[PDB]
Design an enzyme around this catalytic site. Structure first.
Site, mmCIF file in Angstrom:
data_model
loop_
_atom_site.group_PDB
_atom_site.id
_atom_site.type_symbol
_atom_site.label_atom_id
_atom_site.label_comp_id
_atom_site.label_asym_id
_atom_site.label_seq_id
_atom_site.Cartn_x
_atom_site.Cartn_y
_atom_site.Cartn_z
ATOM 1 N N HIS A 1 0.857 -1.227 0.000
ATOM 2 C CA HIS A 1 0.000 0.000 0.000
ATOM 3 C C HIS A 1 0.882 1.262 0.000
ATOM 4 O O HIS A 1 0.455 2.294 -0.532
ATOM 5 C CB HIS A 1 -0.960 -0.018 1.198
ATOM 6 C CG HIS A 1 -1.824 -1.244 1.255
ATOM 7 N ND1 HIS A 1 -2.739 -1.526 0.269
ATOM 8 C CD2 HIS A 1 -1.914 -2.232 2.169
ATOM 9 C CE1 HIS A 1 -3.392 -2.635 0.589
ATOM 10 N NE2 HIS A 1 -2.865 -3.116 1.706
ATOM 11 N N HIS B 1 5.370 6.969 6.766
ATOM 12 C CA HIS B 1 5.121 6.550 5.387
ATOM 13 C C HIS B 1 4.622 7.748 4.635
ATOM 14 O O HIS B 1 4.355 8.808 5.205
ATOM 15 C CB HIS B 1 4.112 5.412 5.335
ATOM 16 C CG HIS B 1 2.784 5.810 5.900
ATOM 17 N ND1 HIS B 1 2.467 5.687 7.240
ATOM 18 C CD2 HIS B 1 1.707 6.374 5.286
ATOM 19 C CE1 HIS B 1 1.267 6.211 7.443
ATOM 20 N NE2 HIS B 1 0.763 6.665 6.256
ATOM 21 N N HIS C 1 2.040 9.070 1.083
ATOM 22 C CA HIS C 1 1.027 8.884 0.026
ATOM 23 C C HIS C 1 1.402 9.804 -1.128
ATOM 24 O O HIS C 1 1.856 10.919 -0.858
ATOM 25 C CB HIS C 1 -0.390 9.190 0.515
ATOM 26 C CG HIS C 1 -0.770 8.483 1.771
ATOM 27 N ND1 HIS C 1 -1.537 7.332 1.731
ATOM 28 C CD2 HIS C 1 -0.460 8.702 3.060
ATOM 29 C CE1 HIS C 1 -1.684 6.891 3.006
ATOM 30 N NE2 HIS C 1 -1.031 7.714 3.820
ATOM 31 N N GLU D 1 -3.417 13.482 0.730
ATOM 32 C CA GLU D 1 -4.714 13.007 1.281
ATOM 33 C C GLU D 1 -5.471 14.221 1.811
ATOM 34 O O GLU D 1 -6.557 14.513 1.325
ATOM 35 C CB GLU D 1 -4.436 11.979 2.362
ATOM 36 C CG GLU D 1 -3.742 10.751 1.798
ATOM 37 C CD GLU D 1 -4.046 9.516 2.578
ATOM 38 O OE1 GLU D 1 -3.784 9.454 3.791
ATOM 39 O OE2 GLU D 1 -4.559 8.547 1.949
ATOM 40 N N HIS E 1 3.240 11.047 6.613
ATOM 41 C CA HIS E 1 2.550 10.751 7.881
ATOM 42 C C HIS E 1 3.520 10.130 8.870
ATOM 43 O O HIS E 1 4.019 9.020 8.625
ATOM 44 C CB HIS E 1 1.428 9.768 7.589
ATOM 45 C CG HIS E 1 0.317 10.395 6.833
ATOM 46 N ND1 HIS E 1 -0.678 9.685 6.180
ATOM 47 C CD2 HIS E 1 0.020 11.707 6.676
ATOM 48 C CE1 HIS E 1 -1.509 10.521 5.622
ATOM 49 N NE2 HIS E 1 -1.146 11.791 5.911
ATOM 50 N N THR F 1 -6.444 6.669 7.494
ATOM 51 C CA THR F 1 -6.894 6.931 6.108
ATOM 52 C C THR F 1 -6.840 5.652 5.296
ATOM 53 O O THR F 1 -7.175 5.738 4.123
ATOM 54 C CB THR F 1 -6.055 8.021 5.435
ATOM 55 O OG1 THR F 1 -4.744 7.486 5.195
ATOM 56 C CG2 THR F 1 -6.058 9.289 6.254
HETATM 57 N N1 LIG Z 1 -2.455 6.851 6.750
HETATM 58 S S1 LIG Z 1 -2.546 6.999 8.324
HETATM 59 O O1 LIG Z 1 -1.427 7.774 8.800
HETATM 60 O O2 LIG Z 1 -3.882 7.479 8.691
HETATM 61 C C1 LIG Z 1 -2.361 5.427 9.066
HETATM 62 C C2 LIG Z 1 -1.564 5.316 10.194
HETATM 63 C C3 LIG Z 1 -1.428 4.098 10.817
HETATM 64 C C4 LIG Z 1 -2.018 2.963 10.323
HETATM 65 C C5 LIG Z 1 -1.819 1.624 10.997
HETATM 66 C C6 LIG Z 1 -0.652 0.938 10.328
HETATM 67 N N2 LIG Z 1 -0.108 -0.166 11.134
HETATM 68 C C7 LIG Z 1 1.136 -0.116 11.657
HETATM 69 O O3 LIG Z 1 1.972 0.752 11.444
HETATM 70 N N3 LIG Z 1 1.510 -1.149 12.427
HETATM 71 C C8 LIG Z 1 0.516 -2.119 12.881
HETATM 72 C C9 LIG Z 1 0.907 -3.039 14.000
HETATM 73 O O4 LIG Z 1 0.067 -3.762 14.490
HETATM 74 N N4 LIG Z 1 2.188 -3.068 14.378
HETATM 75 C C10 LIG Z 1 2.567 -3.963 15.486
HETATM 76 C C11 LIG Z 1 3.449 -3.230 16.461
HETATM 77 C C12 LIG Z 1 4.674 -2.770 15.726
HETATM 78 C C13 LIG Z 1 5.926 -2.771 16.338
HETATM 79 C C14 LIG Z 1 7.007 -2.156 15.734
HETATM 80 C C15 LIG Z 1 6.854 -1.545 14.503
HETATM 81 C C16 LIG Z 1 5.622 -1.563 13.867
HETATM 82 C C17 LIG Z 1 4.529 -2.196 14.456
HETATM 83 C C18 LIG Z 1 3.221 -2.285 13.687
HETATM 84 C C19 LIG Z 1 2.633 -0.938 13.345
HETATM 85 C C20 LIG Z 1 -2.825 3.083 9.190
HETATM 86 C C21 LIG Z 1 -3.023 4.318 8.572
HETATM 87 ZN ZN LIG Z 2 -0.914 7.682 5.865
#
Ligand SMILES: NS(=O)(=O)c1ccc(CCNC(=O)N2CC(=O)N3CCc4ccccc4[C@@H]3C2)cc1
Ligand SMILES: [Zn+2]
EC number: 4.2.1.1
Length: 258
Positions: free
Chosen positions: A62, A92, A94, A104, A117, A196
């Site tokens: 993604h 990350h 977009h 976004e 982000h 998002t």
């Molecule tokens: N577009 S946005 O900025 O709105 C956006 C931000 C965050 C997310 C969630 C993405 N997931 C994640 O980033 N994950 C999920 C997870 O369970 N772990 C386990 C815990 C661990 C431990 C060390 C490093 C990384 C993780 C990952 C982090 C989705 C979308």
């Molecule tokens: Zn994001």
């Protein structure tokens, strides 16, 4: 038949697996600069990244994520609209297929070439997975990218992307300093929102910086050479991995600045 950003599985489809897609605090949103009100109650914003320990960079199909060691309070976001301490876990981007789209959030309906982000979780919930179940679980620092001068602090990221071209690839990515991705000013807008991407959880305090960073055309062209697909699958370029603006509903966007 998994979610993504194609014609058949893109944002307009996500509500069938994730009904919260039509919820009351979805992100991103358009930031109407004339309607956002200065909030004198906002405390100063504190970005403390000097001790950040990056570990790895991952293509997750993604986007690509740079992950950090979050097993103590090294790199933290505090202040602004936030109560307590939020630990950096990953960043990350977009981005678009063309320089005129990719962000976004939008600003008076303007789309930027890309959006960074920096994701942080509220340490009062103990782990990331518990934090995303809370309305104040995450703080995401959003930073717009425009195409112009190169961003020197981005080049180490650009130069590793050839090693994680496809979904599921990772590479070691130690000693990366995310201070090199910040603009000069920390003036921001803030509102309550969501992830998002699926699962679109309503757990985020959004903090969107007003000042974009400049990256070069060559830097963003390298983002656009990544793949959504795994190795040994048909090549689909990783471009236009952005969700469009969602209804603001019963929310106010607050400005940190006059
Ligand atoms: N577009 S946005 O900025 O709105 C956006 C931000 C965050 C997310 C969630 C993405 N997931 C994640 O980033 N994950 C999920 C997870 O369970 N772990 C386990 C815990 C661990 C431990 C060390 C490093 C990384 C993780 C990952 C982090 C989705 C979308
Ligand atoms: Zn994001």
């Amino acid at each position: 038949h998994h979610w993504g950003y194609g014609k058949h599985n893109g944002p307009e489809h996500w509500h069938k697996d994730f009904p919260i897609a039509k919820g009351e605090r979805q992100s991103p949103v358009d930031i109407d600069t004339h309607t956002a009100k200065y909030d004198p109650s906002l405390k100063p914003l504190s970005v403390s990244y000097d001790q950040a320990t990056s570990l790895r960079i991952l293509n997750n199909g993604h986007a690509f994520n740079v992950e950090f060691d979050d097993s103590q309070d090294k790199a933290v976001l505090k202040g602004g609209p936030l109560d307590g301490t939020y630990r950096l876990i990953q960043f990350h981007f977009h981005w678009g297929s063309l320089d005129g789209q990719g962000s976004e959030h939008t600003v008076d309906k303007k789309k930027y070439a890309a959006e960074l982000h920096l994701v942080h979780w509220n340490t009062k919930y103990g782990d990331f997975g518990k934090a995303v179940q809370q309305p104040d679980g995450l703080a995401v620092l959003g930073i717009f990218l425009k195409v112009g001068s190169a961003k020197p602090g981005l080049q180490k990221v650009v130069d590793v992307l050839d090693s994680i071209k496809t979904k599921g690839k990772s590479a070691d990515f130690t000693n990366f300093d995310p201070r090199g991705l910040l603009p000069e000013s920390l003036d921001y807008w803030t509102y309550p929102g969501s992830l998002t991407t699926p699962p679109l959880l309503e757990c985020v305090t959004w903090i969107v910086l007003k000042e974009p960073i400049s990256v070069s055309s060559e830097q963003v062209l390298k983002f656009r050479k990544l793949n959504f697909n795994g190795e040994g699958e048909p090549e689909e370029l990783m471009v236009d991995n952005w969700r469009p603006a969602q209804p603001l509903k019963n929310r106010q966007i607050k400005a940190s600045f006059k």
